């Protein structure tokens, strides 16, 4: 049987790595993209379709699920895996970001109280407990995603609180034997865009010790240049021998650049959400299928894509569906976009394994931005 958690690096090129995370519910190939399944569904896809695209792991959200249908309810029903019909690993975000994004809130050292978008509470202890009730495989520490921009003083105070919360998260996780034995716990680095704070945060997290390390506090409006600048110094601060997870990222070019900077895991609502809105990813860049120019275009969404959508339906048909507001339009766009993202990750993994990732990155960018 597979271990609770084992990350092995099979090949490297510069800062980029490729390998596998073994967990009880399955193997995760890295660098990995996690489709987002916020409300116990990857929107518009059956789990079998999510798997068919190549996904090894999906993301769920503590915040959304605690509100609807409820964490205790999901536990009573057998846990998130059984509930939604996905039997492979699930990573759950801790709520620290979504509560401040979507909720009225009252923040304190204890945690956050908030009104549902009914009053609810999150704290390191309650967040870890909810993730336990869901039966999450990768549990995220409860943190605070510092707003951007942040002054150095505010970024420091925020980061310091997150580090205290990281320790509380660690202890809550460890105190629950079943969770400690079957799931993994990732810490989340904060510190805004400031190198010294990022270093202090990395040091605090490494002292506590986690199974993996997320770079939090990015993809919050800073833009790619700044994000990459922060990754340049932040990722090397994390333990080399554990996965590095960049939360909420991102566009295909964001992913490529982040892998170049040592990131192993990603999640983003972009392929699903923008798919439903008519944006299809292609190797020649994104297209908006609603555009009149596609009304009689018999080509598939992308000329090379191996997904079932591109094997069977035309741009013209999908254009019609999206224009008409048809559910099948959302389904097809989403399946294609998630498949595209997985094919991107596969090309990244293969190119690193073959020592030609730098060339892949260059070729990818040249064509995607042509």
Residue among 44 and 361 whose Cβ is closer to a second copy: 44
Please select the residue that binds Cl ion; options are 11, 52, 269, 328, rule is CB under 5 A: 269
Per the annotation, does 145 bind a ligand?
no
Which residues of the chain form contacts with a second copy (CB under 8 A)?
39-41, 43-46, 68-69, 73, 76-78, 83-85, 295-296, 298, 312-314, 316-317, 320-321, 323-324, 326-328, 330-331
Q: Which stretch binds Zn ion (CB under 5 A): 196-204, 230-238, 304-312, 346-354?
A: 304-312
Please select the residue that binds ligand 6OK; options are 273, 320, 323, 347, rule is CB under 6 A: 273
Q: What is the DSSP letter of 237?
A: G
Cα separation, 90 vs 317, in Å, equals: 34
Copy the structure tokens of residue 122.
């999150």
Q: Select the binding partner of residue 272 from Zn ion, Cl ion, ligand 6OK, none (C-beta < 5 to 8 A, by kind).
A: Cl ion
| Sign of the dihedral through C-alpha 60, 269, 94, 123 | negative
Residue 56 annotated as catalytic: no
Cα separation, 283 vs 157, in Å, equals: 42
Copy the structure tokens of residue 322.
């999206």
E strands present in the chain:
6-13, 16-23, 26-30, 32-34, 58-61, 90-93, 105-107, 112-115, 119-122, 138-140, 184-189, 212-215, 244-246, 265-267, 279-280, 287-288
Residue among 80 and 155 whose Cβ is closer to a second copy: 80
Cα separation, 5 vs 185, in Å, equals: 10
Residue 241 annotated as catalytic: no
- The minimum distance between CB 33 and a second copy, in angstroms, equals 20
Q: Select the binding partner of residue 307 from Cl ion, ligand 6OK, Zn ion, none (C-beta < 5 to 8 A, by kind).
A: Zn ion
Q: Select the binding partner of residue 247 from Zn ion, ligand 6OK, Cl ion, none (C-beta < 5 to 8 A, by kind).
A: ligand 6OK
Per the annotation, does 94 bind a ligand?
yes
| Active-site entry in 56, 264, 267, 302 | 267
- The minimum distance between CB 37 and Cl ion, in angstroms, equals 8
Residue among 317 and 357 whose Cβ is closer to a second copy: 317
Q: Report CA-CA distances (Å) from 49 to 54, 137, 175, 278, 313.
A: 9, 21, 36, 19, 16
Phi then psi for 200, rounded to 5 degrees?
Answer: -60, -40
Residues 104-143 that bind ligand 6OK (CB under 6 A): 140, 143
How many CA within 13 A on the CB side of residue 81? Answer: 15
The closest alpha carbon to 95, from 134, 56, 57, belongs to: 134
Which residue sits closest to ligand 6OK, CB atoms considered?
A: 248
Task: Establish if 273 lies at the interface with Cl ion (CB under 5 A).
Answer: yes
Q: Select the binding partner of residue 317 from a second copy, ligand 6OK, Zn ion, none (C-beta < 5 to 8 A, by kind).
A: a second copy
Residues 6+ apart with CB under 8 A from 258: 227, 228, 231, 246, 249, 250, 266
Q: What is the CB neighbour count within 10 angstroms for residue 350?
A: 14
Please select the residue that binds ligand 6OK; options are 93, 125, 211, 302, rule is CB under 6 A: 93
Task: Establish if 94 lies at the interface with ligand 6OK (CB under 6 A).
Answer: yes
Q: Select the binding partner of residue 268 from ligand 6OK, Cl ion, Zn ion, none (C-beta < 5 to 8 A, by kind).
A: ligand 6OK
Q: Which stretch binds ligand 6OK (CB under 6 A): 213-221, 254-262, 320-328, 353-361?
A: 213-221
Cα separation, 264 vs 186, in Å, equals: 13
- Three-state DSSP class for residue 8: strand
Q: What is the DSSP letter of 95?
A: S
Binding site for ligand 6OK (CB under 6 A): 93-94, 96-97, 140, 143, 145, 188, 216-217, 219-220, 247-248, 268-270, 273-274
Active site residues: 93, 267
Which residues does the annotation place in the binding site?
A: 93-97, 143, 190, 217, 305, 307, 310, 336
Binding site for Cl ion (CB under 5 A): 43, 269, 272-273
């Amino acid at each position: 049987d597979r271990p609770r958690f084992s990350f092995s690096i099979a090949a490297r090129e510069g800062k980029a790595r490729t390998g596998t995370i073994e967990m009880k519910r399955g193997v995760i190939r890295t660098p990995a993209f996690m489709p987002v399944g916020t409300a116990a569904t990857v929107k518009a896809l059956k789990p079998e379709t999510v798997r068919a695209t190549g996904a090894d792991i999906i993301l769920g959200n503590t915040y959304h699920l605690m509100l609807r249908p409820g964490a205790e309810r999901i536990a009573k029903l057998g846990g998130l895996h059984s509930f939604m019909g996905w039997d492979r690993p699930i990573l759950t975000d801790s709520g620290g970001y979504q509560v401040m994004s979507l909720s009225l809130t009252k923040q304190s050292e204890e945690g956050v109280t908030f009104k549902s978008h009914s009053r609810h509470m999150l704290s390191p202890e309650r967040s870890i407990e909810i993730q336990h009730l869901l039966g999450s495989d990768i549990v995220m520490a409860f943190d605070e995603c510092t707003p951007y921009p942040a002054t150095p003083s505010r970024a420091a105070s925020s980061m310091e609180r997150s580090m205290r919360w990281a320790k509380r998260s660690r202890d809550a996780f460890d105190s629950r034997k079943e969770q400690a034995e079957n799931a993994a716990l990732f810490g989340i680095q904060q510190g805004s865009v400031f190198e010294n704070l990022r270093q202090q945060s990395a040091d605090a997290l490494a002292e506590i010790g986690f199974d993996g390390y997320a770079v939090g506090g990015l993809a919050v409006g800073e833009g790619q240049d700044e994000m990459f600048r922060v990754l340049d110094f932040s990722v090397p601060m994390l333990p080399d021998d554990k996965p590095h997870y960049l939360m909420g990222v991102g566009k295909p070019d964001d992913i490529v650049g982040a892998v170049e900077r040592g990131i192993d895991m990603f999640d983003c609502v972009l392929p699903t959400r923008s798919g439903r809105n008519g944006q299809a990813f292609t190797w020649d860049g994104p297209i908006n299928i609603r555009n009149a120019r596609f009304s009689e275009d018999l080509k598939p969404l992308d000329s090379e894509c191996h997904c079932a959508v591109c094997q069977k339906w035309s741009r013209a048909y999908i254009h019609h569906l999206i224009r008409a507001g048809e559910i099948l339009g959302a389904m097809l766009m989403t399946e294609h976009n998630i498949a595209f993202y997985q094919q991107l990750m596969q090309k990244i993994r293969d190119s690193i394994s073959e020592g030609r990732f730098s060339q892949f990155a260059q070729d990818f960018r040249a064509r995607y931005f042509a």
